[PDB]
């Protein structure tokens, strides 16, 4: 998804439904390879 | 005929799908769909 190779529009923004699966969510936010990243109600550690 | 076949040919369960909420898919493998003489060699029960 994040290295999709076209993304939407940002008025055609798409909305993806994601379940029946699991998240590892330590390469995401703790591999540093994005240039901003913040999380809003609540810490990126307490979410994993 | 000849060639039994034996397999789905037709579609007819439903026409459309639009929204879809949950996939899941099992592993590749072959039923024998061949018809069959005498008394029924198969039971099958499930509780849902």
Known sequence: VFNATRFASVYAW???????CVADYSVLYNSASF??????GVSPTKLN | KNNKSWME????????????????????????????????????????
Do not use: H, W
């Open chain 1, 35 to 40: 240039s901003t990243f913040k999380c809003y």
């Open chain 2, 9 to 48: 040919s037709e579609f007819r369960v439903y026409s459309s799908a639009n929204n879809c909420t949950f996939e899941y898919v099992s592993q590749p493998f072959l039923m024998d769909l061949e018809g069959k003489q005498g008394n029924f060699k198969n039971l099958r029960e499930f509780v849902f």
């Open chain 1, 14 to 20: 798409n909305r993806k439904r994601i379940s029946n």
